[PDB]
Amino acid sequence: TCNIKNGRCEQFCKNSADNKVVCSCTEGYRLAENQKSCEPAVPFPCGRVSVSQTSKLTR
């Protein structure tokens, strides 16, 4: 489908059979467990900020 909300894919979406939806990710990422979100597969995946967002903090 991919019709609305990118078929609920965090990055890429493509129409599957029976109007299904298969999500995918860019290099350095892997398809999460929920089959929609993308997670880092390498130490430093493209396009992401990894320095403590504005000064260091604690969580």
């Binding site: 990055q11 860019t26 990422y29 493209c46 396009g47 992401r48």
Partner: protein
């Protein structure tokens, strides 16, 4: 960048600055450990070029800087096929030694032709660089960044006498005051998609800077991603 604000160290880790016959004369983006993508009008051969990734403040030392030599330059095959049109303004630079990826040196993501365009159409991207902060004015020491709205192609065309090809797009504000500028060329126009940034444009040209009625003109990356991937393969 005119009317933007300082970036924070590590906020745009794919940004690099190019140095040559002139210091900090253009920008670029990290495709991978050995390749940088920039604007073709920045590297008209006949000169040695150096790249600095992890750069933040041009006059100080942050200890995050990685300087590399450019051993190969590949401007798009159709760049300068016609004179002074700035069409196909994109080029690739191969590094002599590979960069070491870390928090301050990270590649920018590049989607396929289909999705790069989809992301561009969200209509809001970020441009950055060490170029002029005032038209005909001085350059920045600290990296600058500015969010710029996509401009409808139809209004883009009516804003200038020059030709805006299908390989370009306009971005900026109707009121002016905020724009990329000379010296920022080659730097990235990126679109953030849920925390992950994809390269959607290459800072290319304009008529003066930040003038009301005028907009920044960018190379439409979606039209060149097949070419980029084809030339930057690592072995």
């Amino acid at each position: 960048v005119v009317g933007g604000e300082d970036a924070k160290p590590g906020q745009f880790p794919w940004q690099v600055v190019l140095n040559g016959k002139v210091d900090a004369f253009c920008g670029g983006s990290i495709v991978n450990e050995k390749w940088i993508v920039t604007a073709a009008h920045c590297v008209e051969t006949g000169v040695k070029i150096t790249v600095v990734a992890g750069e933040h403040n041009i006059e100080e030392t942050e200890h995050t800087e990685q300087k590399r030599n450019v051993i190969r330059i590949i401007p798009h095959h159709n760049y300068n096929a016609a004179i002074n049109t700035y069409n196909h303004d994109i080029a690739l630079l191969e590094l002599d030694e590979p960069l070491v990826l870390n928090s301050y040196v990270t590649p920018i993501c590049i989607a396929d032709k289909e999705y790069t365009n989809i992301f561009l159409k969200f209509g809001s991207g970020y441009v950055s660089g060490w170029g002029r902060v005032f038209h005909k004015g001085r350059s920045a020491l600290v990296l600058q960044y500015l969010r710029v709205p996509l401009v409808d192609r139809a209004t883009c065309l009516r804003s200038t006498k020059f030709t805006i090809t299908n390989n370009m797009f306009c971005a900026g504000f109707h009121e002016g005051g905020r724009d990329s500028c000379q010296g920022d060329s080659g730097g990235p126009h990126v679109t953030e998609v849920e925390g992950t940034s994809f390269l959607t444009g290459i800072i290319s040209w304009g008529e003066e800077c930040a003038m009301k009625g005028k907009y920044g003109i960018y190379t439409k990356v979606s039209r060149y991603v097949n070419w980029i991937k084809e030339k930057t393969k690592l072995t």
